[PDB]
Structure formats: C-alpha cells, structure tokens
Assembly symmetry: D3
Homo-oligomer: 244 residues x 6
C-alpha cells in the first residue's frame, strides 16, 4: 500500500496518521509553534509546506495537534478541507484575535463565537446564493463556556464578522455591524464553521479582543502574550473534555 | 399621560403593560390559545388584531405570554419588532415545527436551532448585502439543552433553513441544504434571531420534526399533539429558569 | 373516491368544492368575515385553519368567496398557491390598504395596481435572478376602471411597491420609490400577481390609501370603514361582470 | 435667447419645437422613415444623428412624430431620455416585433404589453437593487385594446421579456419565461416603460409576433409588411384619441 | 448551394464573402461611411440593415472593412456576434470616443484600452455571476502602442468603464471609477472584448477623449474631426501589420 | 522622528527603507527565500512576521526584493496594501503557478496575465457591485513579452481566473471558464492587479502551468524546479529594464 503509505496533500506534508483527533489553529504558524513548544509534551513538527507549520504532541495524556491556517477564508479553507478529509481530524478550535467595534466590548474580552457573519462570496457560490448560517458545534461551545465559568476571564458568547478585507476606507460598516450585534471583526471563523458543516466535523472559535477599532486602542505586545495564555489554557481544557 | 395610557401598535391591541418578560410564540394563533388555556393560570387574552391572538398568564408563579406570529419572515418580523420595542418583551421562545430533509433526522426529533440559514433578502437589505449569521442567545440555548437532558426527547442542536417558499418545484435544493448540515426547513427562525439581534433581545427556537420531506412521511394529528406537549413542557421549564 | 372526497390542504380545511370561481382577499381574516357577513347572502364559513377565515356566499345571484391571506409575500403566496391549484379558484381581487409616499397621492385615493415592484427575493429565486414584471390581468383591471368611472371615488391606476419590511430606519427609500412613480407601499400585491402568472389565474388588486407615510397623516377608524365600503362595492361590481 | 434657439442633444439634431406630443418608435430608423412617408402628411425629417432618423408630420389633423430608438435598452434609453426631457414629448408608442416562446402564442398575434420583465441591470442600479415593475400607462393600454376590439387582429394583452441578449446558447430560459406567462421576447419595452416612469411620461408598446422561437417558424418578408400595416393603423388610431 | 449562396444574418445583409479579416468599428454608421469614403480605395457598401452601414475596401493593398455597431452593449454585441461567426471576421478595432473623469486625463488623449470594467449584467448571466475580465488581444494592443510611439499623439494605455447608462443623477460613481484607475467612460468596449473572448477573435479599442465629464469641457466639432483623423491613421497602420 | 524611525505594519516587521522599488512575489514564503538566496547578492531578510518571509538584495547592480504573499485574495491583498502604501514599493511581479483547464494549454506553458477574472466579492464591495476589470500595467506586460521573445519558453498572453476556491465539487465551471478564454486558474492575480489600480502601482503576473486540471496531469517536483528557474530568469530580466 505505497500510494497510501506516502499519501499527503498539496499544502500539508504529514503522513496520514500524523494528526490528533483535535486541533488548535491560530492564523500564525509561528504562534502554532510557540503553543506546541510551550504546552505540549513529546512534540513532533508534522508539516511545514509553505512555512505553514503544524505539530502533534500530548497534553495530560491526550494527543493534541496545533497548526497555522493563514489569513483569510480562502487560505484557511484549504487547510480545513485537507485536515477534515485526508487527515481525518474531527475537532477544531480556532484560537484567534479580533477587533472590537463598540465600547461595550472591551480589550481583553474573550469572544466565544456562536456564529460568524461574512462578506465572502464563497458560501453563496456553494449554497445557491442563499444565506448560509455558519455556526459552532453546540457541545464544543458549551464546553468552552463551562471551562470559562471556572476562570476570571471576561468572556462574551455571540457573533463575529469574518471579512475578506483587513483595510477599509472608513468605520461606517463597522457601526452597522455593531448595530446588529456583532462583537468583533476577524477573517476565518465563518470559513471554519462552514467547512466543518460540509465535512461533518466539530468546530468552535475563541477570539481575544486584542484591538478596539472604534476606540482606537490596542493591547501591548506583553498584554497579547498574557491573553494568549488565558485562551490556550481554556482551549486545552476543552480539548481534554471531548470524547475519544 | 393619555397618549401613553392608550398606546398600542398597528398589529397589537394590548395595553403597554400587558405582556410578560418572556413569550412563547408558535406560528398559529389558535395553537397560542390552546397553549395558554392548557398550561397557564389566570389567563387574559391581551390582543386579537387580525385574529393574531396573544395571551398572558402565570406558570409556577412566573408571568408568561404566548402569542402567534403568523407565517413567514415578513409577518413574524412585524410582531417581533412591536413586541421587542413598544411592549418591551425581552425573551422569546419560538415553538415551531419543521420538515426534515435527510433520513438521519427522524420524525419526532426536536431541533434546538443554534442558527438559521435563509433565502429571504431582508437581512441583505439591512446589512449591506453581507451574510448575516442569525443565531440563538447562548444562555437560552444552553437552558434548552439542560432541560432536554432530563427528558426522553430525541433532540438535535444545529441549524435550520428559514424559507420564504413553502412550495418548490422539486427536492434538489433540499438535498443541497442537507449536504451542508441543515436539519430541517421552516419559515420564521431566521427572522426571530435577526430581530432579536437588532433589538438586544434574547431568543431561541425549538422545532418539532413533524414532517419528513425527503422520506415522504408525516406525523398523525394525534402524534402532533403528543410532540407539542413535549415541546411546551420544555419551553416552560426554560422560561422558569431565566432571570427576572 | 374517499381520498378526493376528504382532500384539503395544510393551510385550508375546506372541502374541494367549497370556493367560488372568484375570491376577494384582504390581509385580515376578521375583515374577510366582516365582508362576508355584511355583503353576502347564504354565507358559509368554509375554512379556519390558523384563524385564516374564509367564506363562500352569493351576491346578486353569483357565488363569491372572501378569505384572508395574512401579511407578507410568504404568507400570502401559500394561500394563493393552494387556492389556485387544489381549490381551482380562477379570479382573485386583493382588497388591501397602502401607505402613500408623495403629496400628489391623497388619503382616500383608491389605487388600482397595474403592477407591483418588490424587495422580495422570491421571484429572483424562481426566475433565474431576472426582473419579473408582476402585473394585473387586463380584463379585470379594465373592469375595475369601468366600475370606478361610475363613482365619485378618487382613483389612480399605477404601480405599488410590495415590501417584506413594514418597519424601516428612515424615509430615504420611500423618496426613491416616489421618484420612479410608485403610488403606495404595501406587502402582498407582487405575490398575488406572480402566483397568478404561474398558475394561469386572473388577478387584480385595489389598495385604499389609508395612511400617508410622507405627510404623517392617517385615516381615522371611521374613515377606514367608509373607504372599505367604497372598495367592496367596486370589487363586488367587478366580480359580477366576470365570465362564468 | 440663442442658447435655447440652437439647443439640441448629443444624439438628436432637431430644434426644440420639432416633435409632436406623441411619438411612434420602432427600433429601425428605416422603418420610421417608411412609416412617416407612408402614413403622415406634410412630413419633415427633424433628426438624423448617427442615422437615427426621426420625423414629424400630421395624421387626420393631429401632429405625430415617428423615430427609431435602436437596439437594446442602453440605446433606446438614450433617445427616450432626450425626447422626454429636452424635447418634451409626452406620449410614446413603441411599435415593435417579438419572438414567441410557446405554441399558445401564434405568428401574427399582436402583443399589447402590460408589463416587461428583463435581464438588464439598469433598473437595479437606479432602484437600490429592488425589482422595478415596468408597466404601461393604463389609458394608453385601454385605448389600444378599444381600437383592437374594432379589428380582426388576434391580440393578447400581457407581459413581454426585454433581454440584453439576442443570442443565447439554448432555449432553457425561454421555457422558464413561458412557464411564468411571458408572451414574447424583445429588447426595449422595459426601458421605455422605465424611462416613462422616471419622467412622468405616458407609454405603451405593441409587439407583432414575427417569429416563433420555440416552433422555429418565421413570417415571410411580405407577411411582416402586412402585420406592420395592421400595427400602424392601430397605433395611429390610438394617437388620435389621446388628449391634447 | 443556394442556402449558403444567399446566407446572411438578421441584422446584416451582406453576402458571406463580403468582409475583410479586419474591421474598424465606430458606434456611428455615418462615421463608418465617412471613414470608408475618406481612407479606403475601391469601396463597396456591403450592408445597410437598419441603417447600420458597413463597407469593405482596400488600404495600401490590404482588404479592410468599416462598420457601425450602434450604442450600447446589447446593440454592439449583436453585430460582433454576427461578424465573428457567420462572416468569419477575425480582427476588430473599435474606434470610439470616451469621457474623462479626472483632471490627469486630458481632452485629445487617446486611450488604448487594456481592459474594460462594466455595469452590464450580460457577462454575469453567461459566466455564473463571476467577474469576467474583458481584455484586449495582446498582439493588437502592442501594435497600437508601437504605432503610437511613432506619433505626437498623447496616449494612455489602461482601463475604460463601459456603462449601460449615458445619463446619471450625479458624478459620485465617476469619482469612484477614477479612484480605481478608470481613464474614461464609454459603452461598448467591454462587449467587444467579451464577444472576442467567446469567439476566439482578436480585439482592441481606441477611444479619443472627446469630453471631460469632471472638468465640464468638450472638444469642438472641428477638434473632433482632427482627433478622428489621428485615430484612423493609427488604426489603419495597425491593421496593415496584422498577419494574413 | 522616532515614530517614523520605528514605523512598520501589523504584518511586516521591516524598517521603512528596507524594500526595493521592485518586488517579486510568489505565494510561498519558502520559495521567496529560495529565490533570494539563489539569485540575489548581498541578501538581507527584512521581514518574517507570521513566517511571511521577505528579502532585499541586488541583481546586476539593481536593488530587488522578493517576498511571499500567502494564499488567496484576502491574504495577498493585505501584503500588497502594506507594501504599496507604507513601504512605497512601486513595481510588482507575481511569480505564480496555475492549473490549465483545456488541452490547448500545455504543462510548462508560461502564462503572462493581461487580466484576471474572479469569484471574489472584494471588488464588488469596493466598486458598487460593478464588474471591475483587473488588468496588468502595459509597460510591464510588454517587457515580459519582449524578454520572452528572446527565450525558448512556450508562453501565452491572456487571462487567468483567480478563485477563492481551491477545492470544487466538479469540473463544470472549469469548462465554462475555458469556453470564454480563461487560460489557467490560480488565486491572487486579480487581487494584485486590483490593489495596484487602487494604489497607482505597476503590476504584472507570470504563472507557470504546473498542473493540468482537465487532463489530470502534473509536473514532477524536478520539472517544477526547472520551470521556476525559467520564470525567475524572465522576471529578473524585466525588473532590470524598469525605470528607476
């Protein structure tokens, strides 16, 4: 069975057995490396195509993977597709950052995304120009909240907006987003939840409020480190509670 | 203060104080009447404009309202808007029915809707042609699941599709919906969740699988009665657990 | 032939023979009841599912039906579909109300709708995203005008706008509608004319200007009663002139 | 007042007073010439920019104009705009041809267009992506039918589809058009009715069924001449009945 | 072979052999006539249906055709389709005019169109609602620039915007066009480049800046004559360099 | 001037002076590194945020940069925006790969992209839902062709399709693309050309045909190396010919 022994994907160079059932994914592959090296035991780097580093190790006796997805729906969707099909990964926790768009949401809040609005056309293309509701797996959402209830993290459970556009002419659309309940803006949650729906996989996303777009305030580099730690402690706790 | 003493809305003829903080809404105003008369104590019919009956009574010492919303997003949205603004209702439980579109979903399953896809243009109009994620309030979603865990009801927590179209030429779009995880098809959940987002209100929807569109099977009238009872016992239990 | 003897639809509980060839439909089922009880002889209530009351009686020796369609295109379309197929009703007169959007249109004007613009996606879905022209049956339109010429009613023959949205943030879109000739705004005319086109049925709509959105003026309750009477006298006169 | 004495438009080189209140417009400027020279007395050619010939003469003591509009909505709209503004023409009769798309419509039928569907984006651009109902002036529509009732012409009063596309890969969309009541396909009626709505002008369109797209049959050249004559006799009769 | 001996198209009445391999097309058929009569030897008028004049003659020993395409994408597309199929014309040079929308572009500049944006729906209809890039044939583009380098003409190589709308309410969209690099506005370049893509034909467009929409300035009639001459000298030079 | 001395962007950690006027960008940052280390002299790695490596060095006495842009329009657009604004880079050569969709295009062909179609919504969002023509800078396009004419590379100058979707259900849309002249499919050319239009920058893209989607054939790893070398020799030759 050489064809299968040597099987990989165009964007991942891991052998087929290399990933855990559960994966944590930030956008930044260097953050994936920092996470794996800091929190996991017996770590192996399993993929590095295009510098998109992925790792598998153990946490408290459970196999866990960590890998970058890159920026934006089209990049993220490629890795989600390949992981959910070829590599048979089941559970996905996006560990992200977002920008707040209203003073009621504060720097250092942790958003647990029930759903994700978007300005991508990808779902319209696949879904006959209907509005696709991109939502989290309930069990993973609930596990996140149950872990968070045991912490001092200020968290919010609601919707994000996943945009193709990092740069925009002005803040007018941001005010409209806030009017209709959007808690923060980022780029890959809608893609994760949509890919998970297609592939019968389970997904949730945590997004630290690292920047306040409306208030023009930003966490320091050190503050980002602190809040990353809070989010990873939560994510790993959730991973440990998922069935095997 | 006569103007306020006599205030009402064009589609609701209740005085301003007439509703509870929490309302159960089926599509059918006669079902609202059956529910109020069966389950509530000290019931008052508070509105009847256009035959769209609404009621307020008590259950286990808590004030509860029950009212019909009619069929389809544009009808339902009118009542949601008026209730969430003028009448200051906070919490909404849609108590609905849906059609299943895949053999994995069974007649008598109870769908707890995390989100709702749609084919309405209403959100595109209000949201600059972006994709609006219409999702449930987490706390109400979780309370539903926590109540359901104490029962023998077969329930599923996932997405519905809210269509403007009851009648369609064929089942092709239904197969696409199922491919991407849609559990059932109905008409008003997306509108409820979208109105709740606009108005900072809290909403969830329960939908009994009363019909299987793909399998061509249907609950009997008596079976519908049975499953209605299961859903109302759950909804009232959730209402009692909500803050006051 | 028991299956046919007992045939009905999910939203109408009338036997198959219960309706006339010609039906008058307001949105409000209680208005349908008022009309039937006031103007028709030998009246039978033939349907009451969801409180959506329908009636059949006689006027000047001709069988006439009257029934509510509910609010908005998706609700109205369901009843139109079921009436035009299962119950084989041929001729439809929507007897409605609308809001004016320019001072040239006056309270108490009666709009005879040649056509209906819309913001619904329903026609785009069925019509390959083309612009569907939703227009009246000429013979019924002409009969309306020929009856109206024998009265003192101030009437206008032109276009309405059928919206999914009763509530809007501001009057900007209303000014655009008026710029391009829209005479009034309501919710179900486009659906009626589109269903009639699909089903080879004949339709027209009369809409009393009961409210002036731009001028912020409204008919009194008594004035609404008066203008209803004028519209029903016209509609019944038209029904009597239609072929049998 | 030299600026006004010499005023014209970029696509019409007539002095400002040169047109009648009522204009007949075919697509083909050579047909406009044939019509003017055959039917009108005291004819003057008033414009010839780009070969788009226009004429003014008298019929039975009334001033009448005749001018080509060219092919397609963007060409036709330019001439309609300039005529309805600068030259203050009030009444417009498009005298056109169309292709039938169902065996129920016959070669030599004359379609009187109540409305016109389309695949142009022009109205969506001007009308906030709503569906604009492009319909005829009722009085002109009724005058057409009243004249036609005095003839042996087989006529139909209903909807046309105005397409940007003369050439299409196959007849699939044509079958959809017929399913929803479209009587014939042409290119400029929607533009005429939309321009007339914008400019408070009065318009109607007559379209001879000269070709049957579905049946693959075509009028001979001589037959086209015959049916042109029938349509012009009707159009001129209608023009004479319009107020001055 | 009488059927082929007598073959023509509904909008062109030329025999099948009547056109050259290379055609120059302005919008205005009278300009086509002026060009043919001024520059070509041994000229024959080969078509005149609807006044849309076309000609074939010789320039410096090469056969060249010249013909009008009319105004707007739907008119132009018909002639392009018929020429590129039935009449087997290979090379197309649109010789047009455009309006400038920014002070950096000057009256008398000659725009060589690499590409053409648009507001037509025609490509969306044919191309599954994707964005079709309508671009020039490289070899013809390069030949244009190589000829222009030998002149004193101020030329620019970039993008035009082909609109269905000659008349617009204001200049807001024009400022957006300029923000994103559009050099001038006209109506038929996108259609030419799209038809050429469909039919494996080779196309380029030259557009004289005859009007400055933003600056409100216009070439005189005599100046238009001068710049026409410059453009035709360039176009004919390019035609002579194309393979046979 | 410390604020400017220390200025950088959220996705690039280079000092402001670190880039050349001209940059070569593949998707893969490891390919950028291979290119810089193989072809450039005096190389400095100037940025490495998120592993998105960029470099500046010299080739034949000219400063040249090389940097990865990541996968897909939203990722690529971020780097293009930051380079074209903050870092004042003027000239951009995308050095990419694409998949062919028709047997007429061969493995190892080098496509020089005049334009790029797309299925992204990004341009529709910024451009009022018009069709934006995303095209190359003519001078850079011509320099590419003039260099290629001096080689044995089989090259084609035409259009690519830039998709958000790497994975699709079937090849139906690919056949439509080929019908209308698309030479290959990739993900970032449209974004590059659109960003360059916004920012008055100059761009071109070369895409090696490394895979044939329709024929199901693929270059070997060694063959990819060979064709990369051919493309870089061309790109550097073009960079040397650009003004300073």
């Amino acid at each position: 069975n050489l064809y299968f022994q040597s099987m990989s994907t165009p964007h991942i160079n891991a052998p087929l057995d290399a990933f855990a059932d559960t994966i944590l994914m930030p956008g930044d592959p260097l953050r994936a490396k920092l996470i794996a090296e800091t929190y996991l035991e017996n770590v192996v780097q399993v993929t590095d195509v295009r510098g998109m580093l992925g790792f598998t190790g153990e946490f408290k006796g459970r196999k866990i993977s960590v890998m970058g997805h890159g920026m934006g729906a089209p990049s993220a969707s490629i890795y989600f597709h390949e992981l959910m099909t070829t590599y048979k990964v089941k559970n996905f926790i996006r560990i992200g950052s977002c920008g707040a768009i209203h003073d009621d949401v504060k720097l250092k809040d942790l958003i647990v995304a029930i759903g994700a609005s978007t300005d991508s056309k990808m779902n319209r293309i696949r879904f006959k120009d209907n509005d696709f509701a991109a939502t989290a797996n309930y069990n993973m959402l609930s596990e996140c909240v149950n872990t968070l209830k045991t912490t001092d993290i200020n968290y919010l459970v609601g919707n994000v907006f996943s945009s193709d556009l990092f740069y925009r002419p002005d803040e007018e659309q941001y005010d409209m987003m806030a009017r209709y309940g959007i808690l923060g803006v980022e780029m890959e949650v809608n893609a994760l939840y949509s890919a998970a729906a297609e592939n019968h996989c389970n997904a949730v996303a945590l997004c630290t409020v690292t920047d306040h777009i409306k208030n023009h305030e930003h966490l320091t580099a050190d503050e980002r480190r602190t809040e990353l730690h809070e989010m990873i402690n939560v994510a790993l706790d959730v991973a440990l509670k998922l069935p095997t």
